[PDB]
Amino acid sequence: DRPRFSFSIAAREGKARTGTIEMKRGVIRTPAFMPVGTAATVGADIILGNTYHLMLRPGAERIAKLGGLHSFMGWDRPILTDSGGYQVMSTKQSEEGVTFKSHLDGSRHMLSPERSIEIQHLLGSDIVMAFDECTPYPATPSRAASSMERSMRWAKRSRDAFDSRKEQAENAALFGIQQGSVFENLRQQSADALAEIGFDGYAVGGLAVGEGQDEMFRVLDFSVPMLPDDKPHYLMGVGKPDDIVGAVERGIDMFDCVLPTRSGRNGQAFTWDGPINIRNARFSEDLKPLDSECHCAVCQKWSRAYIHHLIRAGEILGAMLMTEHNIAFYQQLMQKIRDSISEGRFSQFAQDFRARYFA
Amino acid sequence: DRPRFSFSIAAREGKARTGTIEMKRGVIRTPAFMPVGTAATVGADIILGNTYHLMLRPGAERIAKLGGLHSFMGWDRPILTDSGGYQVMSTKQSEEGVTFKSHLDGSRHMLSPERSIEIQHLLGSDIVMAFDECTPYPATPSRAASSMERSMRWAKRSRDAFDSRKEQAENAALFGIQQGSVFENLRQQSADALAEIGFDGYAVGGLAVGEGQDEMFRVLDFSVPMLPDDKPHYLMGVGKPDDIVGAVERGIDMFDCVLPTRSGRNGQAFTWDGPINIRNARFSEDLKPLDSECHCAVCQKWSRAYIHHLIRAGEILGAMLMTEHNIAFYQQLMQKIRDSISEGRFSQFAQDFRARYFA
Ligand SMILES: CNc1nc2cc3c(=O)[nH]c(N)nc3c(CCc3ccccc3)c2[nH]1
Numbered sequence A, B: 001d002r003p004r005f006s007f008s009i010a011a012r013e014g015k016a017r018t019g020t021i022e023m024k025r026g027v028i029r030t031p032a033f034m035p036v037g038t039a040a041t042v043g044a045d046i047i048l049g050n051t052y053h054l055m056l057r058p059g060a061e062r063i064a065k066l067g068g069l070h071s072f073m074g075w076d077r078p079i080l081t082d083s084g085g086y087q088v089m090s091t092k093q094s095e096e097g098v099t100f101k102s103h104l105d106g107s108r109h110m111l112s113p114e115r116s117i118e119i120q121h122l123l124g125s126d127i128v129m130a131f132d133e134c135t136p137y138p139a140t141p142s143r144a145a146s147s148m149e150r151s152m153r154w155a156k157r158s159r160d161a162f163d164s165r166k167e168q169a170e171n172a173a174l175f176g177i178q179q180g181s182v183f184e185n186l187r188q189q190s191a192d193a194l195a196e197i198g199f200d201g202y203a204v205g206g207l208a209v210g211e212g213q214d215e216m217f218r219v220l221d222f223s224v225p226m227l228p229d230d231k232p233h234y235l236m237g238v239g240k241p242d243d244i245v246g247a248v249e250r251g252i253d254m255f256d257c258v259l260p261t262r263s264g265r266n267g268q269a270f271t272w273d274g275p276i277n278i279r280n281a282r283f284s285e286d287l288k289p290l291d292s293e294c295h296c297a298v299c300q301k302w303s304r305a306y307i308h309h310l311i312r313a314g315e316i317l318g319a320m321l322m323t324e325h326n327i328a329f330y331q332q333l334m335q336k337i338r339d340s341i342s343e344g345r346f347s348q349f350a351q352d353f354r355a356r357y358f359a
């Protein structure tokens, strides 16, 4: 029987790590990419639930009545859920939480650390995020400090709420979220507060909110070493393939991004030679698959020309084939990352990846 | 090696028949439903190409440059194409053909019997439809007669154009299309003209254009017996499951309809208990699959509640799962039809089907 939660590091190269998270519902290979579960018939080891949407439609109590997200979505492996506040802010804030009104039916909703944990419990997720405040970018030092300090109080409330629910405490895991904007001293205080509380994993919050890759990497350079080395590191909201590679070089183990899902519906396909917009007329007679090396089912069977045709014709099949390819590309990227760290050649992989991806 | 075209009738019950069309690319079991090939990753024995759309994007010459529709769409089994005029009328008409302008780029296009056959040749279709005029409904006797007479002249031109192209004549089949609106005497003249020309199969044209099921069936009652018994009978544009059952009772062997494709994107799912609109709130907590007996992959894994959720959330996955189910439902319907004719119990099947479908 697998444990509730165990993270093992099998190999290291610089700050990069590869290993496994064992949970009751499955093993997660790291570095991991975690796709949205509603994106397609989803290989990923864990998928994301969208807490904010699920609160509003059909509601967390209704999901629980239907047997929880695993049964609802037909996915028996781990699920990670966010705590809902980031999405809410993307409103009246107070030390208690956030109040907001639903655009879909006008109903009022409150979100607090306690309610966020209870919603995630009702959804049945395996990895639960603490309820935090994602600080807007840019932030002054004072506002970033005040926000981070509030998040750390909410992290302790999240911990206590999680521990009070026996089924959750015994079967799920709880991640704390570091805040502090781009300021080293605040990132350090945040890390210190989270480690004193104690969590199963640690997320780097407050990034991928408009700062750009150079600044994000600069913050990761000093922020990730502040987190406990022996626990997983999740960079929330990241990202594009080059963002992922650079974040892994800086010690990140887990990733989520809307790019592959959103990109696919808007016509963007990821390839080892960079992204392409398949709607462009230059693909109307291109018989190559979306990517020349990709092993996914789309690239085994259909050409750029056909997928171009489908999307231009407004056919749903075109978007689904694009999304399937993008999700498969990301998983192939993560597998090459894991293999290269385990083989001690990740630095070369990253250099080779960037030379081709940006050519 | 399979023949270019061979239709064999294995069993009969009343006017209903079941059998097989053998073609070089595959065997088609009849009665057959022929789905749109761009609907999903499509079990069907033959799919439809959309001549009218393909003329306009990317163009028939471009499809031929890309290797033909089979290579383009990744489908190595038979493909049927329409002749393009029905779609064009859904314009300046003359004895030569029809002229029309493209909404997508303003280019002018002419469609004649000769050009329609050449386009279908460039597309590489296995079953080629003669170029006809679909008479609007209602039509006066005079207009219906004039239109049918023109269609019969165009049918002879279609035959000659097809026979002039050796690769087409030796590897594809040509169907003639009966017209004559709702008038028995015109349907008879049309049948007589088509049989004197000689075709591989015979379509009943000019129906499913607003007349309603009672009138359609009334026209089929006298029209299908006019066609050669030993060749397949294709009812163009039909239809809903109850339309198909009644048409098979009247001697039809082949079907096409946009319902399963269109219905799926608009929220309509076909079941043995009738159609349902999955977007309806009554399905928000319904844990049953879309249909209780359906063997398709969707109904093996996911609930009405989940598919409801996906469609309401605007997720592409929801429409694709609906479309996959609908196509699978139609193929299960055709298989039950074929089995019941072959077992001599189709009349009972039709009665049982209608009692449950309309309950
Ligand atoms: C696109 N950029 C982006 N930056 C983020 C920062 C934070 C942050 O500081 N705190 C929290 N809690 N979430 C964040 C998220 C949302 C991630 C998510 C949403 C849905 C499902 C699973 C995971 C972010 N996303």
Ligand SMILES: CNc1nc2cc3c(=O)[nH]c(N)nc3c(CCc3ccccc3)c2[nH]1
Pocket (backbone or CB within 6 Å): B048, B049, B050, B051, B080, B081, B082, B083, B084, B085, B086, B087, B129, B132, B133, B134, B135, B177, B204, B205, B206, B207, B208, B209, B236, B237, B238, B256
């Ligand atoms: C929905 N009702 C409907 N009634 C039709 C009547 C005719 C008719 O009298 N003549 C021709 N040639 N086509 C017809 C069609 C289009 C069928 C089609 C389109 C695309 C691909 C494959 C097949 C019809 N469709």
Ligand SMILES: [Zn+2]
Pocket (backbone or CB within 6 Å): A290, A291, A294, A295, A296, A297, A298, A299, A300, A325, A328, A329
């Ligand atoms: Zn691919």
Ligand SMILES: [Zn+2]
Pocket (backbone or CB within 6 Å): B290, B291, B294, B295, B296, B297, B298, B299, B300, B325, B328, B329
């Ligand atoms: Zn089904």
